[PDB]
Amino acid sequence: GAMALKRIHKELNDLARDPPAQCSAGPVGDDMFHWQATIMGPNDSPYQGGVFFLTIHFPTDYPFKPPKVAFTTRIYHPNINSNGSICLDILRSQWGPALTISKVLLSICSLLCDPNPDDPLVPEIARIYKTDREKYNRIAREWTQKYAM
């Protein structure tokens, strides 16, 4: 409804004056409820140098339910699977209306920097993250080269 659209427009304007991390986001064409985003691989993470694309769909009752957010670029990470689904609490149970798409992107950036392996979407990636960090980082760098450059 109209409340959602007002809030989406406000968050787009907010993002343009103050970009979260090194992210971009906004409408695909004229559709205010379907956005694209990009996140630069954080410096000093194994994703450094990659550019990762995401899709975002706002619900009609935004901001009182979360946007649906998924990666379209492949990424090696304990909380992001091969469909680009993102296991992140604020996109489900911990969403509230004081969150914004800028805060979602900052939280996804932090997630890339410091995973939640006890919340595994990809059990083996979670396991290697915990038991052999040097190997996790090697493989995440390899996948950044393969998919995100």
Tab-separated table of N, CA and C in Angstrom:
chain	number	residue	atom	x	y	z
A	1	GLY	N	0.825	-1.235	0.000
A	1	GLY	CA	0.000	0.000	0.000
A	1	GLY	C	0.855	1.279	0.000
A	2	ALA	N	0.188	2.403	0.274
A	2	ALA	CA	0.832	3.701	0.186
A	2	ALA	C	1.943	3.875	1.269
A	3	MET	N	1.728	3.372	2.493
A	3	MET	CA	2.702	3.448	3.538
A	3	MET	C	4.035	2.782	3.123
A	4	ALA	N	3.941	1.591	2.525
A	4	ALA	CA	5.120	0.879	2.022
A	4	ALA	C	5.875	1.673	0.993
A	5	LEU	N	5.140	2.235	0.038
A	5	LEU	CA	5.766	2.954	-1.022
A	5	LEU	C	6.480	4.204	-0.491
A	6	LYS	N	5.858	4.914	0.451
A	6	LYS	CA	6.468	6.094	1.083
A	6	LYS	C	7.793	5.717	1.775
A	7	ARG	N	7.738	4.599	2.490
A	7	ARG	CA	8.880	4.213	3.260
A	7	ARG	C	10.036	3.774	2.313
A	8	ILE	N	9.664	3.110	1.212
A	8	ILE	CA	10.668	2.647	0.218
A	8	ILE	C	11.357	3.846	-0.459
A	9	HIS	N	10.546	4.832	-0.784
A	9	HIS	CA	11.092	6.001	-1.396
A	9	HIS	C	12.018	6.728	-0.395
A	10	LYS	N	11.592	6.795	0.881
A	10	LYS	CA	12.430	7.410	1.881
A	10	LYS	C	13.793	6.664	2.017
A	11	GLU	N	13.768	5.356	2.008
A	11	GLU	CA	14.996	4.608	2.181
A	11	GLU	C	15.845	4.707	0.955
A	12	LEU	N	15.271	4.776	-0.231
A	12	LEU	CA	16.101	5.030	-1.423
A	12	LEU	C	16.840	6.375	-1.365
A	13	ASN	N	16.132	7.448	-0.931
A	13	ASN	CA	16.746	8.771	-0.809
A	13	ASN	C	17.843	8.770	0.248
A	14	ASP	N	17.628	8.038	1.342
A	14	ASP	CA	18.511	7.991	2.513
A	14	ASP	C	19.854	7.329	1.950
A	15	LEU	N	19.681	6.230	1.197
A	15	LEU	CA	20.818	5.398	0.719
A	15	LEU	C	21.634	6.264	-0.246
A	16	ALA	N	20.973	7.039	-1.130
A	16	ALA	CA	21.715	7.866	-2.088
A	16	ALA	C	22.582	8.906	-1.373
A	17	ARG	N	22.102	9.546	-0.265
A	17	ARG	CA	22.930	10.611	0.516
A	17	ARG	C	23.985	9.952	1.440
A	18	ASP	N	23.737	8.681	1.840
A	18	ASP	CA	24.634	7.968	2.735
A	18	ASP	C	24.793	6.466	2.463
A	19	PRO	N	25.578	6.076	1.418
A	19	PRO	CA	25.709	4.628	1.007
A	19	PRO	C	26.280	3.652	2.088
A	20	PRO	N	25.597	2.511	2.420
A	20	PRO	CA	26.070	1.588	3.462
A	20	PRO	C	27.259	0.815	2.920
A	21	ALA	N	28.318	0.697	3.724
A	21	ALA	CA	29.615	0.222	3.299
A	21	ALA	C	29.925	0.851	1.911
A	22	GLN	N	30.202	-0.085	1.009
A	22	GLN	CA	30.551	0.045	-0.374
A	22	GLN	C	29.436	-0.796	-1.090
A	23	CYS	N	28.192	-0.494	-0.781
A	23	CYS	CA	27.072	-1.129	-1.399
A	23	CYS	C	26.326	-0.130	-2.219
A	24	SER	N	25.545	-0.697	-3.156
A	24	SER	CA	24.608	0.139	-3.989
A	24	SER	C	23.268	-0.628	-3.876
A	25	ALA	N	22.141	0.091	-4.013
A	25	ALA	CA	20.873	-0.601	-4.125
A	25	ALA	C	19.840	0.373	-4.684
A	26	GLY	N	18.916	-0.165	-5.486
A	26	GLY	CA	17.738	0.622	-5.843
A	26	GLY	C	16.831	-0.155	-6.770
A	27	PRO	N	15.725	0.484	-7.181
A	27	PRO	CA	14.709	-0.162	-8.053
A	27	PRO	C	15.296	-0.697	-9.328
A	28	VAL	N	14.753	-1.836	-9.754
A	28	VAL	CA	14.937	-2.348	-11.128
A	28	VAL	C	13.888	-1.613	-12.037
A	29	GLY	N	14.364	-0.666	-12.791
A	29	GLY	CA	13.515	0.030	-13.663
A	29	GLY	C	12.580	0.874	-12.866
A	30	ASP	N	11.303	0.726	-13.166
A	30	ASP	CA	10.289	1.564	-12.531
A	30	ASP	C	9.605	0.857	-11.365
A	31	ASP	N	10.060	-0.356	-11.041
A	31	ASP	CA	9.364	-1.150	-10.038
A	31	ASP	C	9.957	-0.855	-8.655
A	32	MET	N	9.248	-0.055	-7.861
A	32	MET	CA	9.758	0.331	-6.560
A	32	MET	C	9.837	-0.835	-5.591
A	33	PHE	N	9.107	-1.914	-5.835
A	33	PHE	CA	9.146	-3.010	-4.882
A	33	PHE	C	10.163	-4.116	-5.211
A	34	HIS	N	10.839	-4.014	-6.370
A	34	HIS	CA	11.848	-4.944	-6.741
A	34	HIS	C	13.127	-4.165	-6.963
A	35	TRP	N	14.133	-4.427	-6.103
A	35	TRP	CA	15.387	-3.747	-6.244
A	35	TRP	C	16.516	-4.724	-6.537
A	36	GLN	N	17.595	-4.166	-7.026
A	36	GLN	CA	18.888	-4.885	-7.145
A	36	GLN	C	19.843	-4.236	-6.165
A	37	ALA	N	20.780	-4.995	-5.674
A	37	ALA	CA	21.868	-4.400	-4.879
A	37	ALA	C	23.181	-4.999	-5.259
A	38	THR	N	24.237	-4.215	-4.951
A	38	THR	CA	25.596	-4.783	-5.104
A	38	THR	C	26.321	-4.548	-3.775
A	39	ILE	N	27.176	-5.522	-3.458
A	39	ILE	CA	28.065	-5.410	-2.296
A	39	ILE	C	29.458	-5.721	-2.735
A	40	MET	N	30.388	-4.818	-2.505
A	40	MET	CA	31.832	-5.112	-2.697
A	40	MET	C	32.344	-6.035	-1.659
A	41	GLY	N	33.130	-7.033	-2.039
A	41	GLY	CA	33.762	-7.911	-1.074
A	41	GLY	C	34.570	-7.078	-0.057
A	42	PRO	N	34.362	-7.281	1.266
A	42	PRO	CA	35.077	-6.406	2.211
A	42	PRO	C	36.577	-6.567	2.077
A	43	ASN	N	37.276	-5.448	2.186
A	43	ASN	CA	38.742	-5.484	2.215
A	43	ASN	C	39.244	-6.303	3.369
A	44	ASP	N	40.280	-7.067	3.154
A	44	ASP	CA	40.806	-7.898	4.274
A	44	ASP	C	39.797	-9.048	4.674
A	45	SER	N	38.860	-9.396	3.773
A	45	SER	CA	38.061	-10.606	3.884
A	45	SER	C	38.508	-11.443	2.670
A	46	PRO	N	38.205	-12.740	2.647
A	46	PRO	CA	38.476	-13.506	1.453
A	46	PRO	C	37.664	-13.144	0.248
A	47	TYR	N	36.703	-12.242	0.401
A	47	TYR	CA	35.888	-11.753	-0.751
A	47	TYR	C	36.453	-10.494	-1.398
A	48	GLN	N	37.576	-9.970	-0.864
A	48	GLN	CA	38.171	-8.752	-1.386
A	48	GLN	C	38.329	-8.849	-2.899
A	49	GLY	N	37.939	-7.786	-3.587
A	49	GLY	CA	37.986	-7.688	-5.038
A	49	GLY	C	36.763	-8.187	-5.741
A	50	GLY	N	35.857	-8.887	-5.069
A	50	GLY	CA	34.649	-9.406	-5.729
A	50	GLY	C	33.545	-8.351	-5.699
A	51	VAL	N	32.619	-8.489	-6.635
A	51	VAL	CA	31.399	-7.675	-6.587
A	51	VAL	C	30.253	-8.695	-6.574
A	52	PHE	N	29.350	-8.557	-5.600
A	52	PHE	CA	28.314	-9.562	-5.428
A	52	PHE	C	26.952	-8.888	-5.635
A	53	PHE	N	26.123	-9.455	-6.495
A	53	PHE	CA	24.806	-8.910	-6.780
A	53	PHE	C	23.761	-9.591	-5.965
A	54	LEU	N	22.709	-8.851	-5.641
A	54	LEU	CA	21.569	-9.340	-4.868
A	54	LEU	C	20.253	-8.858	-5.435
A	55	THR	N	19.224	-9.634	-5.187
A	55	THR	CA	17.832	-9.228	-5.492
A	55	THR	C	17.080	-8.972	-4.241
A	56	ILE	N	16.207	-7.967	-4.244
A	56	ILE	CA	15.436	-7.626	-3.083
A	56	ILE	C	13.979	-7.417	-3.505
A	57	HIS	N	13.040	-7.993	-2.762
A	57	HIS	CA	11.628	-7.784	-2.989
A	57	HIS	C	11.030	-7.287	-1.700
A	58	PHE	N	10.388	-6.120	-1.809
A	58	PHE	CA	9.705	-5.536	-0.650
A	58	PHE	C	8.290	-6.089	-0.587
A	59	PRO	N	7.805	-6.470	0.601
A	59	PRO	CA	6.402	-6.878	0.736
A	59	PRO	C	5.455	-5.691	0.757
A	60	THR	N	4.161	-5.974	0.525
A	60	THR	CA	3.184	-4.885	0.460
A	60	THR	C	2.959	-4.221	1.806
A	61	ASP	N	3.277	-4.933	2.880
A	61	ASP	CA	3.186	-4.408	4.267
A	61	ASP	C	4.465	-3.973	4.867
A	62	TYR	N	5.448	-3.799	4.010
A	62	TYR	CA	6.708	-3.100	4.470
A	62	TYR	C	6.322	-1.729	5.127
A	63	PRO	N	7.003	-1.304	6.183
A	63	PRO	CA	8.221	-1.887	6.800
A	63	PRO	C	7.878	-2.849	7.956
A	64	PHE	N	6.666	-3.387	7.990
A	64	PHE	CA	6.309	-4.307	9.129
A	64	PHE	C	6.469	-5.784	8.832
A	65	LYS	N	6.965	-6.093	7.652
A	65	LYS	CA	7.578	-7.379	7.383
A	65	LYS	C	8.819	-7.168	6.593
A	66	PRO	N	9.770	-8.129	6.634
A	66	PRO	CA	11.109	-7.915	6.058
A	66	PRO	C	11.042	-8.007	4.498
A	67	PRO	N	12.040	-7.397	3.881
A	67	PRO	CA	12.236	-7.581	2.442
A	67	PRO	C	12.798	-9.031	2.296
A	68	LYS	N	12.534	-9.576	1.104
A	68	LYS	CA	13.152	-10.869	0.703
A	68	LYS	C	14.454	-10.526	-0.019
A	69	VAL	N	15.575	-11.071	0.425
A	69	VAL	CA	16.880	-10.666	-0.082
A	69	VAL	C	17.633	-11.938	-0.431
A	70	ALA	N	18.207	-12.018	-1.652
A	70	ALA	CA	18.979	-13.215	-2.024
A	70	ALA	C	20.136	-12.830	-2.819
A	71	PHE	N	21.259	-13.527	-2.731
A	71	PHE	CA	22.393	-13.296	-3.670
A	71	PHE	C	22.058	-13.843	-5.043
A	72	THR	N	22.524	-13.195	-6.097
A	72	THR	CA	22.526	-13.785	-7.441
A	72	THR	C	23.950	-14.210	-7.823
A	73	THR	N	24.982	-13.655	-7.227
A	73	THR	CA	26.362	-14.115	-7.439
A	73	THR	C	26.703	-15.280	-6.491
A	74	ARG	N	27.324	-16.340	-7.003
A	74	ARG	CA	27.726	-17.396	-6.175
A	74	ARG	C	28.796	-16.965	-5.164
A	75	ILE	N	28.734	-17.571	-3.944
A	75	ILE	CA	29.637	-17.136	-2.922
A	75	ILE	C	29.854	-18.324	-2.001
A	76	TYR	N	31.065	-18.508	-1.461
A	76	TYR	CA	31.374	-19.572	-0.576
A	76	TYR	C	31.234	-19.029	0.832
A	77	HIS	N	30.203	-19.445	1.592
A	77	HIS	CA	29.950	-18.805	2.897
A	77	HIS	C	29.034	-19.735	3.681
A	78	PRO	N	29.231	-19.869	5.012
A	78	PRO	CA	28.395	-20.782	5.766
A	78	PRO	C	26.879	-20.509	5.793
A	79	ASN	N	26.525	-19.218	5.611
A	79	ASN	CA	25.127	-18.796	5.781
A	79	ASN	C	24.478	-18.426	4.495
A	80	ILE	N	25.066	-18.768	3.341
A	80	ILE	CA	24.474	-18.403	2.031
A	80	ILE	C	24.575	-19.642	1.153
A	81	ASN	N	23.458	-20.142	0.610
A	81	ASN	CA	23.532	-21.403	-0.100
A	81	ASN	C	23.610	-21.177	-1.611
A	82	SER	N	23.557	-22.295	-2.336
A	82	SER	CA	23.723	-22.257	-3.807
A	82	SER	C	22.572	-21.590	-4.506
A	83	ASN	N	21.444	-21.424	-3.847
A	83	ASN	CA	20.353	-20.612	-4.426
A	83	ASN	C	20.511	-19.135	-4.101
A	84	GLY	N	21.541	-18.775	-3.335
A	84	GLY	CA	21.709	-17.351	-2.882
A	84	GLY	C	20.824	-17.037	-1.676
A	85	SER	N	20.147	-18.035	-1.068
A	85	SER	CA	19.400	-17.746	0.155
A	85	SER	C	20.314	-17.350	1.271
A	86	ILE	N	19.884	-16.424	2.103
A	86	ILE	CA	20.746	-15.815	3.173
A	86	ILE	C	20.111	-16.154	4.507
A	87	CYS	N	20.782	-16.921	5.353
A	87	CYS	CA	20.317	-17.196	6.723
A	87	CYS	C	20.842	-16.020	7.581
A	88	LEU	N	19.950	-15.129	7.939
A	88	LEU	CA	20.239	-13.947	8.691
A	88	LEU	C	19.011	-13.561	9.487
A	89	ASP	N	19.205	-13.413	10.805
A	89	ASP	CA	18.076	-13.304	11.737
A	89	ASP	C	17.161	-12.111	11.456
A	90	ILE	N	17.749	-11.001	11.000
A	90	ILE	CA	16.941	-9.830	10.791
A	90	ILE	C	16.070	-9.958	9.530
A	91	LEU	N	16.326	-10.934	8.653
A	91	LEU	CA	15.417	-11.188	7.539
A	91	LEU	C	14.307	-12.117	7.845
A	92	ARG	N	14.249	-12.581	9.108
A	92	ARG	CA	13.194	-13.457	9.536
A	92	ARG	C	12.721	-12.988	10.903
A	93	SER	N	13.122	-13.726	11.938
A	93	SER	CA	12.487	-13.515	13.214
A	93	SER	C	12.818	-12.194	13.890
A	94	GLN	N	13.921	-11.566	13.500
A	94	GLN	CA	14.409	-10.400	14.232
A	94	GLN	C	14.142	-9.111	13.426
A	95	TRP	N	13.344	-9.238	12.365
A	95	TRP	CA	12.923	-7.997	11.555
A	95	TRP	C	12.073	-7.058	12.443
A	96	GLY	N	12.231	-5.763	12.342
A	96	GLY	CA	11.231	-4.856	12.900
A	96	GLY	C	11.309	-3.616	12.043
A	97	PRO	N	10.318	-2.711	12.202
A	97	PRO	CA	10.184	-1.566	11.325
A	97	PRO	C	11.269	-0.502	11.482
A	98	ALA	N	12.103	-0.549	12.516
A	98	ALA	CA	13.183	0.383	12.569
A	98	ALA	C	14.346	-0.060	11.684
A	99	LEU	N	14.311	-1.262	11.136
A	99	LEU	CA	15.302	-1.681	10.137
A	99	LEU	C	14.976	-1.117	8.802
A	100	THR	N	15.986	-0.980	8.006
A	100	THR	CA	15.887	-0.334	6.681
A	100	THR	C	16.744	-1.166	5.729
A	101	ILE	N	16.602	-0.934	4.423
A	101	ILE	CA	17.441	-1.652	3.498
A	101	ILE	C	18.928	-1.306	3.698
A	102	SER	N	19.248	-0.064	4.110
A	102	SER	CA	20.665	0.285	4.401
A	102	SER	C	21.173	-0.588	5.571
A	103	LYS	N	20.372	-0.699	6.659
A	103	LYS	CA	20.792	-1.508	7.755
A	103	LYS	C	20.864	-2.990	7.314
A	104	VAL	N	19.969	-3.533	6.458
A	104	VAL	CA	20.049	-4.930	5.959
A	104	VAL	C	21.387	-5.086	5.223
A	105	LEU	N	21.753	-4.137	4.350
A	105	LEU	CA	22.996	-4.299	3.597
A	105	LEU	C	24.182	-4.249	4.545
A	106	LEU	N	24.209	-3.323	5.506
A	106	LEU	CA	25.337	-3.278	6.474
A	106	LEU	C	25.412	-4.612	7.230
A	107	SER	N	24.277	-5.230	7.596
A	107	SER	CA	24.257	-6.500	8.374
A	107	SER	C	24.769	-7.618	7.440
A	108	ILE	N	24.422	-7.646	6.146
A	108	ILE	CA	24.875	-8.678	5.214
A	108	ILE	C	26.371	-8.487	5.018
A	109	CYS	N	26.865	-7.264	4.874
A	109	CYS	CA	28.300	-7.003	4.772
A	109	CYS	C	28.990	-7.572	6.001
A	110	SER	N	28.481	-7.287	7.216
A	110	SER	CA	29.118	-7.831	8.441
A	110	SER	C	29.082	-9.334	8.443
A	111	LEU	N	27.991	-9.871	7.956
A	111	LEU	CA	27.873	-11.351	7.885
A	111	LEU	C	28.968	-11.964	7.017
A	112	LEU	N	29.241	-11.331	5.874
A	112	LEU	CA	30.333	-11.773	5.039
A	112	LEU	C	31.656	-11.728	5.781
A	113	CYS	N	31.839	-10.653	6.562
A	113	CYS	CA	33.068	-10.518	7.338
A	113	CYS	C	33.188	-11.469	8.500
A	114	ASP	N	32.084	-11.916	9.063
A	114	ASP	CA	32.125	-12.734	10.288
A	114	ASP	C	30.861	-13.610	10.292
A	115	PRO	N	30.951	-14.781	9.690
A	115	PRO	CA	29.813	-15.711	9.565
A	115	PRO	C	29.248	-16.204	10.907
A	116	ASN	N	28.053	-16.758	10.803
A	116	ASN	CA	27.422	-17.525	11.893
A	116	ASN	C	27.409	-19.049	11.606
A	117	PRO	N	28.552	-19.754	11.871
A	117	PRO	CA	28.605	-21.175	11.505
A	117	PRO	C	27.729	-22.102	12.384
A	118	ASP	N	27.228	-21.593	13.503
A	118	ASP	CA	26.284	-22.402	14.262
A	118	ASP	C	24.846	-22.377	13.674
A	119	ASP	N	24.671	-21.531	12.675
A	119	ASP	CA	23.427	-21.327	11.933
A	119	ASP	C	23.618	-21.789	10.524
A	120	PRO	N	24.132	-23.012	10.307
A	120	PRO	CA	24.676	-23.322	8.975
A	120	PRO	C	23.589	-23.475	7.858
A	121	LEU	N	23.604	-22.695	6.789
A	121	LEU	CA	22.886	-23.198	5.590
A	121	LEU	C	23.703	-24.161	4.795
A	122	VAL	N	25.021	-24.050	4.876
A	122	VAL	CA	25.839	-24.993	4.092
A	122	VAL	C	26.723	-25.658	5.132
A	123	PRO	N	26.281	-26.845	5.628
A	123	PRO	CA	26.987	-27.458	6.744
A	123	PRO	C	28.505	-27.612	6.574
A	124	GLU	N	28.965	-28.012	5.386
A	124	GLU	CA	30.429	-28.239	5.245
A	124	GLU	C	31.221	-26.947	5.307
A	125	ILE	N	30.644	-25.863	4.767
A	125	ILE	CA	31.331	-24.559	4.760
A	125	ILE	C	31.428	-24.081	6.209
A	126	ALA	N	30.311	-24.214	6.969
A	126	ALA	CA	30.337	-23.944	8.433
A	126	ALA	C	31.392	-24.752	9.155
A	127	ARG	N	31.507	-26.025	8.829
A	127	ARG	CA	32.435	-26.885	9.512
A	127	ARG	C	33.860	-26.446	9.239
A	128	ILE	N	34.219	-26.191	7.964
A	128	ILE	CA	35.600	-25.766	7.578
A	128	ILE	C	35.909	-24.361	8.181
A	129	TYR	N	34.921	-23.476	8.172
A	129	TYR	CA	35.086	-22.167	8.839
A	129	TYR	C	35.566	-22.354	10.267
A	130	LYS	N	34.953	-23.283	11.000
A	130	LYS	CA	35.275	-23.508	12.418
A	130	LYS	C	36.589	-24.269	12.621
A	131	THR	N	36.860	-25.277	11.799
A	131	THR	CA	37.937	-26.212	12.152
A	131	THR	C	39.223	-25.833	11.406
A	132	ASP	N	39.116	-25.091	10.289
A	132	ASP	CA	40.301	-24.758	9.505
A	132	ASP	C	40.106	-23.451	8.738
A	133	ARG	N	40.262	-22.416	9.484
A	133	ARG	CA	39.977	-21.044	8.986
A	133	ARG	C	40.834	-20.722	7.776
A	134	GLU	N	42.142	-21.104	7.809
A	134	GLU	CA	43.095	-20.820	6.705
A	134	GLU	C	42.529	-21.495	5.394
A	135	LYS	N	42.016	-22.730	5.480
A	135	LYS	CA	41.410	-23.412	4.325
A	135	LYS	C	40.070	-22.765	3.895
A	136	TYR	N	39.210	-22.477	4.841
A	136	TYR	CA	38.004	-21.726	4.469
A	136	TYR	C	38.339	-20.443	3.662
A	137	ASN	N	39.291	-19.676	4.167
A	137	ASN	CA	39.614	-18.450	3.512
A	137	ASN	C	40.172	-18.684	2.108
A	138	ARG	N	41.026	-19.690	1.959
A	138	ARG	CA	41.593	-20.080	0.635
A	138	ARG	C	40.471	-20.391	-0.331
A	139	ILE	N	39.550	-21.233	0.096
A	139	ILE	CA	38.505	-21.584	-0.854
A	139	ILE	C	37.543	-20.406	-1.161
A	140	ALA	N	37.268	-19.584	-0.153
A	140	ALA	CA	36.410	-18.416	-0.400
A	140	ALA	C	37.104	-17.427	-1.367
A	141	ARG	N	38.429	-17.267	-1.249
A	141	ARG	CA	39.153	-16.439	-2.201
A	141	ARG	C	39.027	-17.098	-3.628
A	142	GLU	N	39.189	-18.419	-3.692
A	142	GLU	CA	39.094	-19.082	-5.017
A	142	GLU	C	37.736	-18.875	-5.665
A	143	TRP	N	36.696	-18.978	-4.835
A	143	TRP	CA	35.353	-18.767	-5.403
A	143	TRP	C	35.083	-17.291	-5.768
A	144	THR	N	35.713	-16.352	-5.058
A	144	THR	CA	35.616	-14.931	-5.405
A	144	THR	C	36.221	-14.737	-6.809
A	145	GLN	N	37.386	-15.307	-7.042
A	145	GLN	CA	38.010	-15.246	-8.384
A	145	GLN	C	37.135	-15.874	-9.469
A	146	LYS	N	36.535	-17.020	-9.113
A	146	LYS	CA	35.787	-17.809	-10.113
A	146	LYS	C	34.461	-17.114	-10.503
A	147	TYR	N	33.785	-16.472	-9.519
A	147	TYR	CA	32.396	-16.037	-9.748
A	147	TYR	C	32.178	-14.546	-9.642
A	148	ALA	N	32.976	-13.865	-8.846
A	148	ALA	CA	32.633	-12.507	-8.447
A	148	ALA	C	33.538	-11.447	-9.058
A	149	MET	N	34.372	-11.788	-10.066
A	149	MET	CA	35.254	-10.735	-10.687
A	149	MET	C	34.825	-10.371	-12.081
